A and B are shown apart, each in its own frame.
Chain A
Amino acid sequence: MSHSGAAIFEKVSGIIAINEDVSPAELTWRSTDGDKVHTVVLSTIDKLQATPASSEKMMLRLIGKVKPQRHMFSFNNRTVMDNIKMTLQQIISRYKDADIYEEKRDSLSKEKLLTNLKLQQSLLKGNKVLMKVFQETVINAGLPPSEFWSTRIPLLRAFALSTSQKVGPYNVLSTIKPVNKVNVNLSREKILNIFENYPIVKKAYTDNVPKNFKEPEFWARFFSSKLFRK
């Protein structure tokens, strides 16, 4: 498999295993007799160091971010080492992106419209000229709020319809193009559209976003997953 194999640590031979189920992922090295055990959390790894394929040695070092922590593993077969290098690269790359992201960061009738105080407050806050009239005519003069909005029904309706309309359905996943390093540009509008067209994505989104990992990691896994292809 690509998640386990033989390795030698500190001149001691043992089995190296890559644990990805537990978040954050950690690498556990277990000695043949089990006398000595070493475990390292992949979140602390800054860079991945691997010996060149042109050298007889087949070592592989995992350097930790800070006297930076250093873990050196010696393998026996290049294919086994290669089978583990690529898998380890995926975990670090996704977590590095997550770390980068973390560091970087009806109601259209006269009755209801005259009764929807939230909408009346919402439109008034944005509008400044209406504040001038409202402040003088309602606060100081004392005109009833209901009477003031009686003659401005079209104004209330126009503002409500702006935020009360939604675009039609469409093939959302087909628009996404991965465009080695490949970059994609998602948007909040795209996120909502994906959920509506594909309830399964929402099902896996609601149950894992706060629990396990941040949204950028979730969508990084989703696109790389076979589910996105399917």
Chain B
Amino acid sequence: KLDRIEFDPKKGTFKYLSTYDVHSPSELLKLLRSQVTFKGISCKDLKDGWPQCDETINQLEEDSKILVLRTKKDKTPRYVWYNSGGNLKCIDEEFVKMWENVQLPQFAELPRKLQDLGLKPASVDPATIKRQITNTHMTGILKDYSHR
């Protein structure tokens, strides 16, 4: 009767029913893609019933097939997600540091600066958003037919 145990009428055995019956990388990849919410399958239950999951998860992490949230205490995969984008690492660190150095101009002035550069500004300055009796014996018989 318990939901965590699966019965086998073929042999008459009781086997543990894991939350996600996955034992191969191919099955895991399709399982994540089938998720309807953005919640990541916890490695705690995925590791249970799977002799090796970090090795498989790490293999997929290198290939950018899935998204993995890493622990802060010790390196260990937490809830994972399907990678709907491209490669996870496709930019050199020498440019990431330069990305941090870049400081964006004032919001109200960005379109003007971009327009001065000649690039099409996909936005506008918010300052331009223009926010736009006689015969009283028939007290209630008369219906207001004001227009036609």
Chains A and B share a contact (CB less than 8 Å) = yes
What's the nearest-Cβ distance from chain B to residue A1, in Å? Answer: 17
Complex Cα distance, B36 from A34, in Å, reads 9
For chain B, the count of residues having a C-beta within 8 Å of the partner chain is 2
For the complex, give the distance between the alpha carbons of A26 and B37 in Å: 24
Across-interface contacts of B36 in A (CB, < 8 A): 32-34
Contact indicator per residue, chain A 166-189, by CB within 8 Å of chain B (1) or not (0) = 000000000000000000000000
Interface residues on A, range: under 10
- How does the 8 Å CB contact mask read for B35-53 relative to A, with 1 for contact and 0 for none? 0110000000000000000
Label chain B's interface by main secondary structure: loop
Interchain pairs with CB closer than 8 A, number: 5
- Bitwise, A46-83 to B at CB < 8 A (1) or not (0) is 00000000000000000000000000000000000000
List the A side residues contacting B37 at CB < 8 Å: 32-33
Across-interface contacts of A33 in B (CB, < 8 A): 36-37
CA distance A34 to B37 in the complex (A): 10
A15 nearest in chain B by CB position: B36
A interface majority secondary structure: loop
What is the CA–CA distance of A33 and B37 in the complex, to the nearest angstrom?
7
- Chain B residues lying within 8 Å of A34, measured Cβ to Cβ, are 36
CB distance from B122 to the nearest CB of A (A): 23
A33, closest chain B residue (CB): B37
Within 8 A of B (CB), among A17-58: 32-34
A31 nearest CB neighbor, chain B only? B36
> Which residues of the other chain, B, contact A32 by a CB distance below 8 angstroms?
36-37
A95 to B45, CA, bound (A): 49
Minimal beta-carbon separation of A12 from chain B (angstroms) = 14
Complex CA gap A100/B36 in Å reads 41
Interface residues of B in 34-85 (CB under 8 A from A): 36-37
Give B99 Cβ to nearest chain A Cβ, in Å.
35
Within 8 A of A (CB), among B92-126: none
Give B15 Cβ to nearest chain A Cβ, in Å. Answer: 24
CA distance A44 to B37 in the complex (A): 32
Assembly CA distance A171 to B37 (angstroms) = 55
Measured CB to CB, the nearest residue on chain A to B37 is A32
What's the least CB distance linking A216 to chain B, in Å?
Answer: 35
In the assembled complex, the CB of A153 is this many whole angstroms from the nearest CB of chain B, namely: 68
CA distance A210 to B37 in the complex (A): 42
Distance to closest chain B CB from A52 (angstroms): 21
Closest chain-A Cβ to B40's Cβ sits at a distance in Å of 14
User: Whole-angstrom distance from the CB of B95 to the nearest CB of chain A?
Assistant: 39
User: How far apart sit A32 and B36, CA to CA, in the bound complex (Å)?
Assistant: 7
Interface string of A79-117 (1 = CB under 8 A from B): 000000000000000000000000000000000000000
Q: In whole angstroms, how far apart are the Cα atoms of A32 and B38 in the complex?
A: 10
What's the nearest-Cβ distance from chain A to residue B3, in Å?
13
Closest-CB distance, A3 to chain B (whole angstroms)? 18
* Distance, CA A71 to CA B36, complexed state (A): 24
The docked-state distance in angstroms from the alpha carbon of A84 to that of B49 is 44
> In the complex, what residue of chain A is closest to B39 when comparing beta carbons?
A33
A19 to chain B, nearest CB (A): 17
A32 to B35 alpha-carbon distance, docked (Å): 10
B-contacting residues of A (Cβ < 8 Å)?
32-34
Contacts A/B (CB < 8 Å), 5 sampled: A32-B36, A32-B37, A33-B36, A33-B37, A34-B36
Q: Identify the 5 closest CB pairs spanning chains A and B, nearest first.
A: A32-B37, A32-B36, A34-B36, A33-B37, A33-B36
